[PDB]
Design a protein around this ligand. Sequence first.
Ligand SMILES: *CC(=O)Nc1ccc(NC(=O)C*)cc1
Lengths: 518, 17, 86
Amino acid sequence: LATRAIPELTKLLNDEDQVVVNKAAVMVHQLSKKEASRHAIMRSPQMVSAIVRTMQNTNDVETARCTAGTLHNLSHHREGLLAIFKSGGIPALVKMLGSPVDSVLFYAITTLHNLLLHQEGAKMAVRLAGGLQKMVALLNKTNVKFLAITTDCLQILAYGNQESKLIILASGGPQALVNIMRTYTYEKLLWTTSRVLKVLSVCSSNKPAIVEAGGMQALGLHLTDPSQRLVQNCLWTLRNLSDAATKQEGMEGLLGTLVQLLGSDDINVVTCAAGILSNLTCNNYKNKMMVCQVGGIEALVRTVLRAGDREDITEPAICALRHLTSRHQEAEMAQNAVRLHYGLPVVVKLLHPPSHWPLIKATVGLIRNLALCPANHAPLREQGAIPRLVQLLVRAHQDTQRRTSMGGTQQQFVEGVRMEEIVEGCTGALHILARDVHNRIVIRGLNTIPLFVQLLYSPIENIQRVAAGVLCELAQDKEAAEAIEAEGATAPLTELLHSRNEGVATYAAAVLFRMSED
Amino acid sequence: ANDCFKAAWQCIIWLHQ
Amino acid sequence: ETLVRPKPLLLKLLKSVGAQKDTYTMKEVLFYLGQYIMTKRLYDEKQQHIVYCSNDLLGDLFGVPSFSVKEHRKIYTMIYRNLVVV
Ligand SMILES: *CC(=O)Nc1ccc(NC(=O)C*)cc1
């Protein structure tokens, strides 16, 4: 087509008469409509260098719409973006994210959105021009599709850049991004807003502020929405963002939704569902109540059955069961429902190989909770719990007894289990199982008493608690009492009766009560 | 004549159940 | 916590030391019962870890003429048959 008028127009926008400028940009936006004349403006950096100035320095409305509208018509074409960038448009477009009119924002927030993706360098120049602050401030617009572009721009800038993740936090971010998920219904916006909340979660600086505003309770609203691209992102967020949600309510519906997700054909959902319940039941009293009231035992026991040896599923599942079976009103039922739903045999099998150690650390801790309700004393002995709990206790001692290593004794994690914890739990579990008399013949018969006595010197105050307690539960029978009184115990227990915690000044005194008396 | 009994029960009550 | 409602063949024991309620925590039952043995003098003041109850109310509730102080479980289960838990 034709150019032959751009230098004529190059100076006409710079005319000091702010009325001719309106009568000048009125055709530039119109002449930018065709693909032909569009290439002319792009090849004239003297022309675009005047449109940018007329944007950041105008009092009219049609000029601001025609200018920022022209810059949008260039964004679809490649070399029309570099001209905007080499003319210093980014500091000007970010400005108009402040002036209040809707006609320019769809033209500005889009011209930035294309500039963030299809041209490099903008992801840095926008952060320097203070773009994140003006972008979060315009999250309260009544439009929904406009927010799908605005929230997506936040995802591009805060991706893997903890400088940007901290800016959105300081400028009131999480508390506003929740009132977007909690309100609107557009899938594209909710998919992006959840996609933003996740890369804000891994940074342990936004984790409480999202919880504090009300993120969990609102993200669970859309757990039933069809599009799976939105479902797992919400689950992925909660899993990373449930670490600091242990102390608030309103989750009443959130827990009666993850339980149903345990019976889903998607393994990557159950893994991101039991891990949530494992963290959301570590300290709260009434959270454990709500799980046991939605039938959470039966549904969670079945998960381990079909999980098999996949420890990534059983590790949070056993930890979740350990929480429900301890210290709350619904205790006698939570410890009973595992039996009635045929969960006792499989739990004992997890003690045996090939189960790794962090899962076993949680399973040997589950037995001490399952053994509170005395209706589980016989089935545990029937499934071979005593001879297997002793085996794990034997190695745990015959491995931390390798104090002979380098000058100072190297203690080795890596595997994740501090081997003093398996002794702290096994001898803590046997302390409960040694109430039923038939166990006290097996525990005795397995030649274990002269081993608790050597544990009784361990400087750990949690070993003495259970070792000097499991011996008290063995001290009833004289067949085991005056036998303990030979293999030590007479002297090491003599001055456990002045250790600090009043749980060891007793027990250790309860063993001496029956022994060398009459 | 009455202390070795009292100190025994307030240890059997320790364990609850 | 834990609340149990005893059977009235037990309540006579607690109603003798000054009990007033009809249901009790296990801490209270083990308290009123320990006061009965101390008041009625049932221990053997020689070596005091033995309780006698040949022809006494405990000798009817429990069933054993002489039980030890720390036999735990039997005592725990001996008390757990004259009550009905609520
Ligand atoms: C818990 C415990 O066993 N306390 C206890 C019981 C008995 C005695 N012996 C005497 O009182 C004579 C000491 C402590």
